[PDB]
């Protein structure tokens, strides 16, 4: 497990930071702050030790710190770290990661 600014998540929970919301479009038209919506793309900043599926063996999380992932719409837990917003999800709740 790894920790982001002195916070180590437990079991298979991961801590992510959502990407910046879109304020302007390509052609220059700007968007209101309320209608931006929740950003579903995030970066994993902390990972847990992994849930124990079977006794005697520890299964680590699939994602790693520094991976661009796509969050589900529901399922996050609010974490306030250094007056900043982060979201705790389960390892299985993440839809997928952007590989590049």
């Amino acid at each position: 497990g790894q920790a982001f600014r002195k916070f180590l998540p437990l079991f298979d929970r991961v801590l992510v930071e959502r990407s910046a919301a879109e304020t302007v479009t390509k052609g220059g038209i700007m968007l209101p702050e309320k209608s931006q919506g929740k950003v579903l793309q995030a970066t994993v900043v902390a990972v847990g030790s992994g849930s124990k599926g079977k006794g005697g063996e520890i299964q680590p999380v699939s994602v790693k710190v520094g991976d661009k992932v796509l969050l589900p719409e529901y399922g996050g837990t609010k974490v306030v770290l250094d007056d900043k917003d982060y979201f705790l999800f389960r390892d299985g709740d993440i839809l997928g990661k952007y590989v590049d």
């Binding site: 479009t25 390509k26 052609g27 220059g28 038209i29 700007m30 968007l31 209101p32 309320k34 209608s35």
Partner: protein
């Protein structure tokens, strides 16, 4: 056959009032003999004739922040794009691409619709006040 006879008929029918006959002959000369002429109440001492050309309809702007003429408190553009909507405009994605055409060609936009709801209104006023895009609903 002549507008003089038109003025004579309107004068005789208005109890010999030559000014009424002249103001009806002028209206029929301007908007046509088979045209729409409407009698309305006046707040002055004398009668007057107002010729309305083009498409004028009794609907105001949705938001007062669209005013760009300080002298008459009007919203005036030249060579403006017109976007017409049968249904009510509410979503962000239903009004953004029209704003992209308006911004790319640098042309003003007037959106005539049933109504403009909160998200589209917020987008329009925020774009009008922040970057300077010319748009009225």
């Amino acid at each position: 056959t002549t507008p003089e006879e038109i003025a004579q008929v309107a004068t005789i029918s208005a109890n010999g009032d030559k000014e009424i006959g002249n103001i009806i002959s002028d209206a029929m000369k301007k908007v046509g003999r088979k045209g729409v002429i409407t009698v309305k109440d006046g707040k002055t001492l004398n009668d007057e004739l107002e010729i309305i050309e083009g498409m004028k309809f009794d609907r105001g702007y949705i938001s007062p922040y669209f005013i760009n003429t300080s002298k008459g408190q009007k919203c005036e553009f030249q060579d403006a794009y017109v976007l017409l909507s049968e249904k009510k405009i509410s979503s962000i994605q239903s009004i953004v691409p029209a704003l992209e055409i308006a911004n790319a060609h640098r042309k003003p936009l007037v959106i005539i619709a049933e109504d403009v709801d909160g998200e589209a209104l917020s987008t329009l006023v925020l774009n009008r006040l922040k970057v300077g895009l010319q748009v009225v609903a």
